[PDB]
């Protein structure tokens, strides 16, 4: 089963998640409407191209870690 979708404003940025040279991702995340590449690991944790080496439990947690890392910078399309 895919995780549920989400939509919130986190640290002033809109983060959204939804079930759907880069893999064919079963789930999509956006930060202010720009897609963030995310990936699920076998144990159910998530990572993203902004924070690839530090797994977090959910795609919303990956979106929030990306906003934390970006420190206000716009994401670029991948």
């Amino acid at each position: 089963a895919a995780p549920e979708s989400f939509d919130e404003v986190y640290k002033g940025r809109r983060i959204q998640g939804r079930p759907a040279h880069e893999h064919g991702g079963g789930y999509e995340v956006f930060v202010d409407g720009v897609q963030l590449h995310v990936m699920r690991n076998a144990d159910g944790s998530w990572i993203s191209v902004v924070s690839h080496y530090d797994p977090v439990p959910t795609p919303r947690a990956a979106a929030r870690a990306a906003v934390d890392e970006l420190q206000g910078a716009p994401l670029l399309p991948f």
């Binding site: 590449h37 990936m39 690991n41 993203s48 902004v50 080496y53 716009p74």
Partner: protein
């Protein structure tokens, strides 16, 4: 070709290494290494095709990727070889590695920007071009997201593991490869990426020149594992969907197999092994 511990380089060797790296960057060659790495980081998956990491070929793939990079450095200055960073020994922000004559230090607290050394954005010599966000400056936060680098004792606990890799040959595996990569256990390679922070913690991690030194030490640990376990070898050995078996070729090169890369001494030796 001798790969030497970074800590041991002379002033002249540090100067020549930095100059060769900066010339690869100037000429445009450096950024295509960053782009190739990113393409595999984002495409390898635990449930499908996987080559450059989360998989048994993590080690031979990086051994060939690092040989491609070293050969490019040698095309600029034939005296330069890739040094390695023993993060179990050189484990603080005060290490010589992070001095202004070598890689520069940590980033400032406001935006993570590295402010000193040859790779600082202010030099004009290290634009971050292959990137996932607008920021074009090298960033680091040494020790920011995780408190400590691995210790020698932790490294030994991984070197003691006899199986090279195990089914399902991905981030859930037991065995040496996945414990050195760090998805399970005390965590060696992934934790170093998290510890450096900045671009090293992202899917464009070769943007920091420390990438190469980190992976040259991971490559050395594979060599040490081999000497610990002369009876153990690369697996799988044939017929495994989505995974590079011993005698299958690896993308992107297509002309080399794990088997061609098991013996590093065909290409270089270490200062000590």
């Amino acid at each position: 070709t001798v790969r030497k511990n970074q800590a041991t380089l002379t002033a002249d060797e540090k100067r020549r290494f930095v100059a060769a790296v900066l010339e690869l960057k100037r000429s445009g060659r450096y950024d295509e290494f960053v782009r190739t790495h990113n393409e595999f980081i984002m495409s390898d998956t635990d449930s499908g095709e996987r080559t450059g990491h989360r998989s048994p070929s993590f080690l031979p793939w990086h051994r060939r990727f690092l040989l491609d990079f070293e050969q490019a450095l040698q095309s600029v200055d034939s005296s330069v070889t890739l040094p390695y960073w023993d993060w179990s020994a050189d484990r603080t922000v005060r290490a010589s590695l992070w001095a202004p004559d070598f890689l520069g230090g940590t980033g400032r607290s406001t935006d993570g920007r590295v402010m000193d050394g040859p790779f600082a954005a202010s030099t004009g010599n290290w634009p971050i071009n292959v990137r996932v966000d607008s920021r074009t400056y090298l960033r680091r936060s040494l020790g920011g997201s995780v408190a400590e680098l691995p210790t020698r004792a932790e490294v030994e606990s991984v070197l003691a593991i006899s199986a090279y890799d195990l089914p399902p040959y991905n981030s859930a595996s037991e065995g040496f490869r996945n414990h050195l990569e760090g998805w399970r256990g005390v965590n060696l390679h992934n934790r170093v990426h998290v510890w450096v922070g900045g671009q090293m913690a992202t899917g464009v991690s070769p943007n920091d020149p420390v990438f190469w030194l980190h992976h040259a030490y991971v490559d050395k640990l594979w060599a040490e594992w081999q000497r610990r376990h002369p009876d153990s070898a690369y697996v799988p050995t044939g017929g495994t969907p989505d995974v590079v078996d011993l005698n299958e070729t690896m993308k992107p090169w297509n002309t080399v197999r794990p088997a061609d890369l098991l013996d590093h001494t065909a290409y270089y030796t270490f200062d000590a092994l």
